[PDB]
Coordinates of C-alpha atoms in Angstrom, one line a residue:
Chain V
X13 CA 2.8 -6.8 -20.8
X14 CA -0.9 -6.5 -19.3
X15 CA -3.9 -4.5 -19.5
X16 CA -5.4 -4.8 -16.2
X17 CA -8.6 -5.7 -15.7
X18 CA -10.6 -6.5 -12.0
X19 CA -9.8 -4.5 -8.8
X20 CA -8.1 -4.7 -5.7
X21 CA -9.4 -3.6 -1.8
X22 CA -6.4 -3.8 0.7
X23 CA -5.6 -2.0 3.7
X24 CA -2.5 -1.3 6.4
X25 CA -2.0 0.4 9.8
X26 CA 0.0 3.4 9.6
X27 CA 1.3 6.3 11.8
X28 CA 1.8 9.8 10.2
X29 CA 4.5 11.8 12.5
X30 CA 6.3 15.2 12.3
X31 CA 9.9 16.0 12.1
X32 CA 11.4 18.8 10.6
X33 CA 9.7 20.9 7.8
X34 CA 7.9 17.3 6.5
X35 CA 5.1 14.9 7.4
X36 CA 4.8 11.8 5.8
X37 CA 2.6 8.4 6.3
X38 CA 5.0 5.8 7.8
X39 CA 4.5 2.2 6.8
X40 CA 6.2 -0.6 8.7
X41 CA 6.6 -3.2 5.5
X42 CA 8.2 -6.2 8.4
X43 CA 4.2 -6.1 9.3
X44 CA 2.2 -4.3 6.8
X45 CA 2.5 -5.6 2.6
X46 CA 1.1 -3.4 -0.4
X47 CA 2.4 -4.8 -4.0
X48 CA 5.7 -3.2 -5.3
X49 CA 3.9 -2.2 -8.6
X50 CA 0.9 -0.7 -6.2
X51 CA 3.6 1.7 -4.0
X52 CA 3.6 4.7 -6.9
X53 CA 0.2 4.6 -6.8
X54 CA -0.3 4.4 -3.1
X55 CA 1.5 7.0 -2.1
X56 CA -0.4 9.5 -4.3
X57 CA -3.9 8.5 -3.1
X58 CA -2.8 8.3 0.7
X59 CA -0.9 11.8 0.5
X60 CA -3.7 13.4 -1.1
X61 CA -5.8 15.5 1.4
X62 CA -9.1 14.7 -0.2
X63 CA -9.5 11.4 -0.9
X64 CA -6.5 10.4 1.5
X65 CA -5.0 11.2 4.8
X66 CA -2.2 13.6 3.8
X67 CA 1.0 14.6 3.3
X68 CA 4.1 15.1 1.5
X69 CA 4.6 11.4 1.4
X70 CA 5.0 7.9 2.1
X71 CA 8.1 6.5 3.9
X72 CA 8.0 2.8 4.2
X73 CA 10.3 1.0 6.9
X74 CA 11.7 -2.5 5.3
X75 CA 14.4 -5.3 6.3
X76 CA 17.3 -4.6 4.8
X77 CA 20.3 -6.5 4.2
X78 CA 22.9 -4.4 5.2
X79 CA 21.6 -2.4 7.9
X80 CA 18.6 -3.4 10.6
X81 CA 16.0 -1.1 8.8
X82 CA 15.9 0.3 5.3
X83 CA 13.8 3.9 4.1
X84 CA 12.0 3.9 1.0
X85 CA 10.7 6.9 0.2
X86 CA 7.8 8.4 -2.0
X87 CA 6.9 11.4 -3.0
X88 CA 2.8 12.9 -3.3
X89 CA 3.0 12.2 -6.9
X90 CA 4.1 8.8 -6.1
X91 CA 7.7 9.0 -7.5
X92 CA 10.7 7.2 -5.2
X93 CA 13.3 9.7 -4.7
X94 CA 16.3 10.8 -2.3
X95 CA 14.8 11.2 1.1
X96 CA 18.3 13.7 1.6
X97 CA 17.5 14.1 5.4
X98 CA 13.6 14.1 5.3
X99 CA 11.8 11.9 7.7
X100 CA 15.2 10.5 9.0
X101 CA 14.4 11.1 12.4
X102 CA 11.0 9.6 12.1
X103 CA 12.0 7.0 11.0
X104 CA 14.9 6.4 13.9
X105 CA 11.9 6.9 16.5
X106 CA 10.0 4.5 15.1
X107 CA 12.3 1.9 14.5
X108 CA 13.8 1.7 18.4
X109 CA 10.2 1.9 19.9
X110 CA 8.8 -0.8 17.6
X111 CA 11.8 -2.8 18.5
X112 CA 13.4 -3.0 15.0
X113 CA 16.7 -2.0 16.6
X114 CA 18.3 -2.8 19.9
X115 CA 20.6 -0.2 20.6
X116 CA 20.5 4.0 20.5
X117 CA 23.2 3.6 18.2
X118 CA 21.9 2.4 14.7
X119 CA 22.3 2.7 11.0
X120 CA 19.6 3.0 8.6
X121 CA 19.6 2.4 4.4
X122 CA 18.5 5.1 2.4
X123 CA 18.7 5.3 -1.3
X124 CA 21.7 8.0 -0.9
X125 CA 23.8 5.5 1.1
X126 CA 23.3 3.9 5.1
X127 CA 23.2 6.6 7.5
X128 CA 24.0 6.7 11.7
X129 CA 20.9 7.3 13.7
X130 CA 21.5 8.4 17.4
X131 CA 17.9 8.5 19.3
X132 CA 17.5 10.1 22.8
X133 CA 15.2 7.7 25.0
X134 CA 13.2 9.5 27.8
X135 CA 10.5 7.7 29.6
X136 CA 10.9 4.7 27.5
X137 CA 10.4 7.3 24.3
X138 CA 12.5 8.8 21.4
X139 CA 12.4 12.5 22.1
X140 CA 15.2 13.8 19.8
X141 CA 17.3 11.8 16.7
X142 CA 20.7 12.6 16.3
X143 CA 22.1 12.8 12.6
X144 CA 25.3 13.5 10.6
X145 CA 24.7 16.6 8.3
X146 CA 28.2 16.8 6.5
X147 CA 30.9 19.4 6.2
X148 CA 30.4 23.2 5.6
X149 CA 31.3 24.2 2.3
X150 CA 33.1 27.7 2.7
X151 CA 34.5 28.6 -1.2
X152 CA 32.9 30.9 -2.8
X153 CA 31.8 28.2 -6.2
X154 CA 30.9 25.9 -3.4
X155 CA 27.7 28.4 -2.3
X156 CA 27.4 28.8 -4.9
X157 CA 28.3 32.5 -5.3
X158 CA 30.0 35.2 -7.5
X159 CA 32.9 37.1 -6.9
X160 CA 36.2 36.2 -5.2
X161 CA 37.2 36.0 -1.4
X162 CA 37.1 33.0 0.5
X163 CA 40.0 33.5 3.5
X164 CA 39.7 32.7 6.9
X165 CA 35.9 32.1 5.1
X166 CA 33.1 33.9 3.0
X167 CA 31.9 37.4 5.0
X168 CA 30.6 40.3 2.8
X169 CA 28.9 43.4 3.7
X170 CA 25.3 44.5 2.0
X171 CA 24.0 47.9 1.7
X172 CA 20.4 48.0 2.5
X173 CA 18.2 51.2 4.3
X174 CA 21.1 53.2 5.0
X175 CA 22.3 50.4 7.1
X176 CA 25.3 48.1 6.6
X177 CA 24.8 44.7 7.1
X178 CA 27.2 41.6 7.2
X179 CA 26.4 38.2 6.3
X180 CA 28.5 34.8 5.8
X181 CA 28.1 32.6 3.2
X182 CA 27.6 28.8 3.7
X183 CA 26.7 25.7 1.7
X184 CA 25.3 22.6 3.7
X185 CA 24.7 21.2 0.6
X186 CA 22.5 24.1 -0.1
X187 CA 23.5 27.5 0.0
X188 CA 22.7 30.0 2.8
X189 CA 23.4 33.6 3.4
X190 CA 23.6 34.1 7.8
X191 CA 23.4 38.3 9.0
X192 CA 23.3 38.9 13.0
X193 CA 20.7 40.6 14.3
X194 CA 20.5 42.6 17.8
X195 CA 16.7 41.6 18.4
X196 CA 15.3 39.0 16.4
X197 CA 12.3 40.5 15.8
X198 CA 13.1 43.6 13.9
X199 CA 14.7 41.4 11.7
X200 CA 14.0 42.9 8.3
X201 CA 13.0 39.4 6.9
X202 CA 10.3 40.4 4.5
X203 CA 12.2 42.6 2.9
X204 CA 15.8 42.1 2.8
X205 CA 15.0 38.5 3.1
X206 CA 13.8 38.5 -0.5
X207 CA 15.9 41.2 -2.3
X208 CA 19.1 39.1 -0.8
X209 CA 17.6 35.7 -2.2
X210 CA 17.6 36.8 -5.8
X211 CA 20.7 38.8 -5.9
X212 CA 22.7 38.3 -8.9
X213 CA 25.9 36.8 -7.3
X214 CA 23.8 33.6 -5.9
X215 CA 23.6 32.1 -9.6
X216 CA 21.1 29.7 -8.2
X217 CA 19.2 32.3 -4.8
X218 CA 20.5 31.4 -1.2
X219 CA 18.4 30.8 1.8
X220 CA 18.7 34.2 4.7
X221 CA 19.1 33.8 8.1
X222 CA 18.8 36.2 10.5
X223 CA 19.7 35.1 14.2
X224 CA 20.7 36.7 17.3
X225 CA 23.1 35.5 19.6
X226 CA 21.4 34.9 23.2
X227 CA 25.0 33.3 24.6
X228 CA 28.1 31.0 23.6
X229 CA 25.2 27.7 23.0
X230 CA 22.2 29.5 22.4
X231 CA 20.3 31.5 19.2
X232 CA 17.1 32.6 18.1
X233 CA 16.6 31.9 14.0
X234 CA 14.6 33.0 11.7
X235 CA 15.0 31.9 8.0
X236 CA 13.6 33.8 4.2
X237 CA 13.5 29.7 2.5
X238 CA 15.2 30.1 -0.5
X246 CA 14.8 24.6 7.6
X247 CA 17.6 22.4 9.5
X248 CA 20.6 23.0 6.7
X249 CA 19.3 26.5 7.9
X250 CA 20.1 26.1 11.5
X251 CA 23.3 24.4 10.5
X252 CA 24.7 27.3 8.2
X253 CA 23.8 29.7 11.1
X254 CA 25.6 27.8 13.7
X255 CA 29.0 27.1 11.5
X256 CA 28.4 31.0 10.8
X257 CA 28.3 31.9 14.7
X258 CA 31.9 29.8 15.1
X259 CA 33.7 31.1 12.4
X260 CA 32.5 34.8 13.6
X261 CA 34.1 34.1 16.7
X262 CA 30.7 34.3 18.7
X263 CA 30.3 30.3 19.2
X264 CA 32.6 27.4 19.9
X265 CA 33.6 24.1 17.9
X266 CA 32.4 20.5 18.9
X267 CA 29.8 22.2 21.4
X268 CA 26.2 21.5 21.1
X269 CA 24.5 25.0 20.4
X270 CA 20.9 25.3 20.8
X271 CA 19.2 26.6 18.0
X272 CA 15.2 28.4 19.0
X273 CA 13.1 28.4 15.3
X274 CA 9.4 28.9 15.1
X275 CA 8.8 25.1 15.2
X276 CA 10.9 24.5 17.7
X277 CA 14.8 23.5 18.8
X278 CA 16.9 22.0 16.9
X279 CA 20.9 20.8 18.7
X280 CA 23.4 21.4 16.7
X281 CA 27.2 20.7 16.8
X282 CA 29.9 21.2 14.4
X283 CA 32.1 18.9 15.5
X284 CA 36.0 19.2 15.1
X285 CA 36.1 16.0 13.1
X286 CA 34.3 17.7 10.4
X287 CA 30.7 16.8 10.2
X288 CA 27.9 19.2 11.5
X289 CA 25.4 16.9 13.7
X290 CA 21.9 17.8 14.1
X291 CA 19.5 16.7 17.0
X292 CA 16.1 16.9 16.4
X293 CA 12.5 15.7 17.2
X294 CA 9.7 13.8 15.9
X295 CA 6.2 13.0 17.0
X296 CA 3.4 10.6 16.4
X297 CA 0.3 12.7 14.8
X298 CA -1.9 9.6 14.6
X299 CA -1.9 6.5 13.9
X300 CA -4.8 4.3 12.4
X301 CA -5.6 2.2 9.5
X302 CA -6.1 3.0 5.9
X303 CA -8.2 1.4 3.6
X304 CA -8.0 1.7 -0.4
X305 CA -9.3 0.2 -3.8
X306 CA -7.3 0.1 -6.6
X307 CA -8.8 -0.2 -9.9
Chain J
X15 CA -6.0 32.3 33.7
X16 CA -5.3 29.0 32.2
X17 CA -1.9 27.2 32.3
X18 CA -0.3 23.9 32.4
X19 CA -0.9 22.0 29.8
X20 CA -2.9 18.2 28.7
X21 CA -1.6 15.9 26.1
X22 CA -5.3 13.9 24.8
X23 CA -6.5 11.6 22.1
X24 CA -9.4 10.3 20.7
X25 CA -10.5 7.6 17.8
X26 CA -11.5 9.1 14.5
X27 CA -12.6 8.5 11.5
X28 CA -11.7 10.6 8.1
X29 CA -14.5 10.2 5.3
X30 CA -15.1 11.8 2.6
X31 CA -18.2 12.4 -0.2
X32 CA -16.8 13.6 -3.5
X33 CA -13.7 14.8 -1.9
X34 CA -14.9 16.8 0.4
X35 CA -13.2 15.4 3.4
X36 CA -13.5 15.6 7.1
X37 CA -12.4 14.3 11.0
X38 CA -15.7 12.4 12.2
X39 CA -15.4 12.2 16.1
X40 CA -18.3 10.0 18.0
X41 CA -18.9 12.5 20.9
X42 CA -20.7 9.6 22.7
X43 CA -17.7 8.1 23.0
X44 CA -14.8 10.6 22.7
X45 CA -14.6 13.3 25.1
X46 CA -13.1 16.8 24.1
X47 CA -13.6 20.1 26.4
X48 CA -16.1 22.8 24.5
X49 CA -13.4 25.5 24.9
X50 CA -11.3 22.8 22.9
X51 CA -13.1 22.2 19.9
X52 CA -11.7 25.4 17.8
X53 CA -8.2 24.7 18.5
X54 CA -8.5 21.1 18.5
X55 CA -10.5 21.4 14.8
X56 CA -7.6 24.2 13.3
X57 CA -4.7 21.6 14.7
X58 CA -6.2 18.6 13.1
X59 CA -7.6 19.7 9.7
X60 CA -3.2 21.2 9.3
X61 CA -2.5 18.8 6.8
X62 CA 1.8 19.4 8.5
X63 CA 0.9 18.9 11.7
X64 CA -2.6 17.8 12.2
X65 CA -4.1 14.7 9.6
X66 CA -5.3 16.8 6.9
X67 CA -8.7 17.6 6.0
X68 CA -11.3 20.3 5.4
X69 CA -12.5 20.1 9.3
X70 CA -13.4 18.5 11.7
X71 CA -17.4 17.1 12.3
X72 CA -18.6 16.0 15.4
X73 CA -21.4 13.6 15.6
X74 CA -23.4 14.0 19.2
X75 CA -26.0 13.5 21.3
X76 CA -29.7 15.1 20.2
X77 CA -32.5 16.2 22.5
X78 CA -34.2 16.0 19.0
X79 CA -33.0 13.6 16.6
X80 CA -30.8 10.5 16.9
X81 CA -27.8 12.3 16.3
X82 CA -26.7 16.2 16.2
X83 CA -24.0 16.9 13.9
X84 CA -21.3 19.6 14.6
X85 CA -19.1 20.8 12.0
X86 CA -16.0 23.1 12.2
X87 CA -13.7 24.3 9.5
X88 CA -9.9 24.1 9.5
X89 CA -9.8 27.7 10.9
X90 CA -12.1 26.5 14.0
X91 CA -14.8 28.5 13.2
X92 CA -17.8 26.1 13.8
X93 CA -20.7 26.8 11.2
X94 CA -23.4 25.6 9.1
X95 CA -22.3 22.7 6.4
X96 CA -24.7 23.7 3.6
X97 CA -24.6 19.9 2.9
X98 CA -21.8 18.9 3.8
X99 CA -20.6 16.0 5.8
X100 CA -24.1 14.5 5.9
X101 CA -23.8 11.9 3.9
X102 CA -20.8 10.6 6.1
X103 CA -22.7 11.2 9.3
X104 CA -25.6 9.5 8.5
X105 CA -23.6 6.5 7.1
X106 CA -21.6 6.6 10.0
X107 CA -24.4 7.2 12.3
X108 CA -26.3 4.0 10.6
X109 CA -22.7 1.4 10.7
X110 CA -22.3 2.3 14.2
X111 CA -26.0 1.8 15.3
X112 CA -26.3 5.0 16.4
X113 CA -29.9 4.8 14.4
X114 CA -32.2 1.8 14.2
X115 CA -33.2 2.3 10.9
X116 CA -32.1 3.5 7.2
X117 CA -34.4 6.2 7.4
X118 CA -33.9 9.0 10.3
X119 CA -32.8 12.5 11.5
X120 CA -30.2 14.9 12.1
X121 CA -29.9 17.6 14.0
X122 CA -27.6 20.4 12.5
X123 CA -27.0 24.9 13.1
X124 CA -29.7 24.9 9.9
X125 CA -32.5 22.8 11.3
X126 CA -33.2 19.2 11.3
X127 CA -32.6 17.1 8.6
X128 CA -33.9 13.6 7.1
X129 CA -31.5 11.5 6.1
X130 CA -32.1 7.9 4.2
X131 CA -28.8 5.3 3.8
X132 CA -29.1 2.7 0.8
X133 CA -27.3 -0.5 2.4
X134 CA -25.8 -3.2 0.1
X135 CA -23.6 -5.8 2.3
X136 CA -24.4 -4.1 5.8
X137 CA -22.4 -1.2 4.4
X138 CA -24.0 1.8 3.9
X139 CA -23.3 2.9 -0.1
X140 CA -25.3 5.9 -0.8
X141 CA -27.0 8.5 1.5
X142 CA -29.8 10.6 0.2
X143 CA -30.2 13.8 2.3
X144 CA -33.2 16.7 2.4
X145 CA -31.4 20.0 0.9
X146 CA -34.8 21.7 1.3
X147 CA -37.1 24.0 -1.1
X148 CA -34.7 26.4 -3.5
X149 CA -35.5 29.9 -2.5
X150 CA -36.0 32.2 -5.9
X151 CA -36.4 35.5 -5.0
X152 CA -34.0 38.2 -5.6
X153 CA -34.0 39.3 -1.4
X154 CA -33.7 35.3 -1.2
X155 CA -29.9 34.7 -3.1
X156 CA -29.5 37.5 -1.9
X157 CA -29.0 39.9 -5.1
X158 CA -29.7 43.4 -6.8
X159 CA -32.4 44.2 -9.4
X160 CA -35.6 43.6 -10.3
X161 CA -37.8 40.8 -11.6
X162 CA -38.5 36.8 -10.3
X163 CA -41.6 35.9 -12.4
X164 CA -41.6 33.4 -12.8
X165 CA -38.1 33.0 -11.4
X166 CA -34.8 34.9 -12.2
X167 CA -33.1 34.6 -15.3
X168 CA -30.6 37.3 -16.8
X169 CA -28.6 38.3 -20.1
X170 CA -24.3 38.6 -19.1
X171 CA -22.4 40.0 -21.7
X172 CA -18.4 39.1 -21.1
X173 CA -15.6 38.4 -23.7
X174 CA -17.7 39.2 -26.7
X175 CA -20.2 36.1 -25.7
X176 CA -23.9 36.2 -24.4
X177 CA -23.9 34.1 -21.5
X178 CA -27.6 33.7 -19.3
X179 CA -27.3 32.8 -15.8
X180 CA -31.0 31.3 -13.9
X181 CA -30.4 32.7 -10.1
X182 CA -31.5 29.9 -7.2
X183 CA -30.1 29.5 -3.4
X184 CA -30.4 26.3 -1.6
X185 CA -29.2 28.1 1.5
X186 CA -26.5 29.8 -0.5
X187 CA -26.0 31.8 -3.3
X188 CA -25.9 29.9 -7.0
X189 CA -25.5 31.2 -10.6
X190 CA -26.5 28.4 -12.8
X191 CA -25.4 29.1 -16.6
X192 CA -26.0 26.1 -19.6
X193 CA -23.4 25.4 -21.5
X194 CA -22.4 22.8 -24.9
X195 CA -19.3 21.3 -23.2
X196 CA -18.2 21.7 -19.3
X197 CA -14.5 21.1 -20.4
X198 CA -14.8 24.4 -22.4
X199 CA -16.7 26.2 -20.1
X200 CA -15.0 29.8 -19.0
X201 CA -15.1 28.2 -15.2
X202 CA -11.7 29.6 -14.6
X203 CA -12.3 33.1 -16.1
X204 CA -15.9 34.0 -16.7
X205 CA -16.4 32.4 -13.2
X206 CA -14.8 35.0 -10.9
X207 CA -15.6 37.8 -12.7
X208 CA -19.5 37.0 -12.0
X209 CA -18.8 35.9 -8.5
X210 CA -18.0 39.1 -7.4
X211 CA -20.3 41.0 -9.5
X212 CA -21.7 44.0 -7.8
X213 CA -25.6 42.3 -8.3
X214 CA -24.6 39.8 -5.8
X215 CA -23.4 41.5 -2.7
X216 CA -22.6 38.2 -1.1
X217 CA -20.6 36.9 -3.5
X218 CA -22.6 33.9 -5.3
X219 CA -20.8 30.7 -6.7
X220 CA -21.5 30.1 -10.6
X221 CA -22.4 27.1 -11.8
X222 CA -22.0 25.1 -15.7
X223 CA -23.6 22.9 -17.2
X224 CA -24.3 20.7 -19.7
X225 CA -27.2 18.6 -20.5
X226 CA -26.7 15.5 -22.0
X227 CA -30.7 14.3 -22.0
X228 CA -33.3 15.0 -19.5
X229 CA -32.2 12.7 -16.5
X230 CA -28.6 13.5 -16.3
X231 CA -26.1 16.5 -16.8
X232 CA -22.4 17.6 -16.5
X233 CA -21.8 20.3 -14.1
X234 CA -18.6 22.3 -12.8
X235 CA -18.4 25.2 -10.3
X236 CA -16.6 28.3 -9.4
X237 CA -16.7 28.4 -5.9
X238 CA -17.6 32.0 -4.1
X239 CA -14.3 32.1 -2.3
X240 CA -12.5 29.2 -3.1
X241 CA -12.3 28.8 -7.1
X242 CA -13.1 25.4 -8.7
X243 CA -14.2 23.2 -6.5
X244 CA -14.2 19.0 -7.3
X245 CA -18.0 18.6 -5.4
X246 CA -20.4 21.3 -4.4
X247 CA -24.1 19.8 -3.6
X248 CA -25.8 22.5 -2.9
X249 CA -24.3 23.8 -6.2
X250 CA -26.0 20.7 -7.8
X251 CA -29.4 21.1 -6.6
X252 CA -29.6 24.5 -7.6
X253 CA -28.5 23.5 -11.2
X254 CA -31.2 20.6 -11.4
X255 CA -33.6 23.3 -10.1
X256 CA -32.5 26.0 -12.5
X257 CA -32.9 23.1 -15.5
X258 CA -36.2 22.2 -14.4
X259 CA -37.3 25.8 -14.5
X260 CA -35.6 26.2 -17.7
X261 CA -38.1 23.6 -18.8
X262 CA -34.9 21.4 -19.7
X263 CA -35.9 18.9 -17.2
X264 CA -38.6 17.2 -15.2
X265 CA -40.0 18.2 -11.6
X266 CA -39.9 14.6 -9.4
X267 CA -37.3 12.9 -11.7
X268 CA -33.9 11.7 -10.2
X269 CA -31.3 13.6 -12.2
X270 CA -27.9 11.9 -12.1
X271 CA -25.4 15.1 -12.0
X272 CA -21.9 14.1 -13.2
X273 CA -19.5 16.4 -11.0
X274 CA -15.1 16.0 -11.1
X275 CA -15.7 13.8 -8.0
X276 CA -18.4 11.5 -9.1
X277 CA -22.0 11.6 -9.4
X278 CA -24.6 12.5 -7.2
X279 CA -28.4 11.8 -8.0
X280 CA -31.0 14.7 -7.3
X281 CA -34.5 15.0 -7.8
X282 CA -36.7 18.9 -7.1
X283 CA -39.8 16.8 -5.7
X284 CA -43.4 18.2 -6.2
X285 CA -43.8 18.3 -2.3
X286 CA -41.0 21.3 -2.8
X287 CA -37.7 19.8 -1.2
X288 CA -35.0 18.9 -2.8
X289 CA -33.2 15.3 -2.3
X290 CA -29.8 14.5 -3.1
X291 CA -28.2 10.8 -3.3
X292 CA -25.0 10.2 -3.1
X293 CA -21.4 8.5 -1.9
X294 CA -20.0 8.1 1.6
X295 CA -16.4 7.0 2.1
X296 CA -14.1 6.5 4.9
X297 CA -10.4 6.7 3.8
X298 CA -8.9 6.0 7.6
X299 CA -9.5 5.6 11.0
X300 CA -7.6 5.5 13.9
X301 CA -6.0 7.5 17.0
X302 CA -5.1 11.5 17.2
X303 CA -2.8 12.5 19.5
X304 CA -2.4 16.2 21.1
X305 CA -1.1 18.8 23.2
X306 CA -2.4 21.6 24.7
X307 CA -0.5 24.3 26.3

């Protein structure tokens, strides 16, 4: 091994965009090269908001051998870890406007496995990204959460104010606790949000969701974070309660903004959702 | 009644001294409407959905200087910088030949300010900006009590420890107490208690150090506030003016002050003002792009 000694000055373009929840700095590695052992490293400096640009991260776009584009992504401490979902859609965006990909259709390699991509192309521009989100999980040590009942699916009433509530249980890979509301804005999300998150029969806390149902493809959402796996829950919740159909595409109104969401008869619960360029530039760095 | 809606961009630059860190916009080249500026400031300093940053600092045309520097804080509040930013501006302002020379001015909210760049390789390395005179009277901090002859120094009993703090303002309020070791220093606990004392009705930001010899010193602050903060210059001019008072340092000596974020090199001149030398660094620059609706 080596002790270092001298020091290094590089630079690459960038372009940090928005999805979901996450920013991160996106690095196109067909044009741009930092040294493998400089990536941990990088990715901490140019997340931090001090001394860098920031964010919660560096995703780098690379050739891949199995797919046309491959996602490497790094955490603000510089570690390389699971993406699961983040910066997906930024990343599809990207790669059909920067002509990495030729169709609408495409797959992309993540550390988890190769993923579908499905962009929407407006005026020559990726509005929305289509991606698979999996199968609901319905059994009650699936949630995970205590007690038994399961069939048709998990519904449980809740006792709070002198009013009974209802909500339905649903993991998307993490768990999440759904209650209809009349008017979204009297939700009580501050306060049964958090007394419901901690309760003792989610052994490891659940994500609330309160939505109201405007029609049979449209709902207000509002979620107490333990949020796309969010908007999913709430729209397999809305179908099994009878209020929304299968294999439509329901349109789900957050405080950021829509999300599209299908559960599909197949199985899978697919997600449309957007991304957007914040900036894009050049950053320059010194390691030493 | 406003409506529709514009989708804009300019070029920016993001700098930082210490990491303190900005958006540096070249208003004689960008273009952004006035009743703009607040929202555009709060979106871009969002480090989620803006670029990150503790504001956003315009650099402008001056009736009286070269350049006028405007700066706004991540809320969009535009304000003074107490020093902040002008380090950055007056590199930039040099690089991008907005100046003809390494010494000039710059127009800020708090008055007109001198500015002198050190260039190495037709890069601008240091900056070394006017801070002014300390102001040592109690009104002047501002603060409660009695006595500033010949300037204010007080006893602070807390946690069974005599502490003595030496009272300055460079603009703002400062608490400068002397310690043995800054990495022991009750920054984290003696610090807020003071801040809020009820003898500084403003608040006032406590400073420590530690003085290794007689040009150079250690130095951490509790920001009035924020908390611990990695650079505040106004912070270390009021602790090289509270050492020189002390009689622990020299009048007209450059004082090297070794902060979290690196050093900065200060000298309490016999004219009165106080100059302070440091780092200017630009992390990115590129394009923003926005909406308005």
């Amino acid at each position: 091994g080596l002790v270092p000694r001298g020091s290094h000055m590089s630079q690459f373009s960038f372009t940090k965009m928005h999805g979901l929840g996450n920013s991160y700095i996106y690095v196109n590695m067909f044009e741009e090269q930092i040294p493998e052992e400089d990536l941990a490293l990088v990715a901490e400096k140019v997340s931090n908001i001090n001394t860098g640009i920031g964010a919660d991260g560096m995703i780098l776009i690379c050739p891949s051998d199995v797919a046309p584009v491959k996602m490497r992504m790094f955490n603000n401490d510089g570690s390389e870890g699971k993406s699961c979902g983040n910066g997906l859609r930024c990343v599809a965006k990207y790669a059909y406007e920067h002509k990495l990909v030729e169709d609408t259709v495409f797959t992309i390699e993540t550390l988890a496995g190769i993923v579908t991509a499905e962009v929407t192309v407006e005026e020559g521009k990726v509005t929305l990204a289509k991606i698979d989100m999996g199968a609901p999980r319905l059994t009650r040590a699936e949630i995970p959460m205590l007690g038994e009942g399961e069939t048709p699916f998990i519904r449980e009433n809740f006792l709070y104010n002198n009013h009974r509530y209802a909500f339905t249980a649903v993991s998307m890979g993490n768990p999440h606790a759904v209650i209809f509301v009349d008017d979204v804005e009297q939700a009580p999300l501050t306060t049964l949000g958090p007394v419901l998150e901690t309760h003792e029969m989610f052994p490891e806390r659940v994500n609330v969701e309160f939505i109201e149902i405007l029609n049979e493809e449209e709902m207000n959402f509002r979620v107490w974070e333990r949020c796309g796996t969010g908007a999913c829950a709430a729209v397999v919740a809305s179908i099994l309660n009878g209020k929304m159909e299968r294999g439509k595409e329901i349109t789900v109104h957050l405080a950021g903004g829509d999300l599209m969401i299908a559960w599909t008869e197949e199985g899978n619960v697919l997600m449309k959702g957007p991304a957007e360029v914040i900036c894009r530039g050049v950053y320059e760095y010194k390691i030493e």
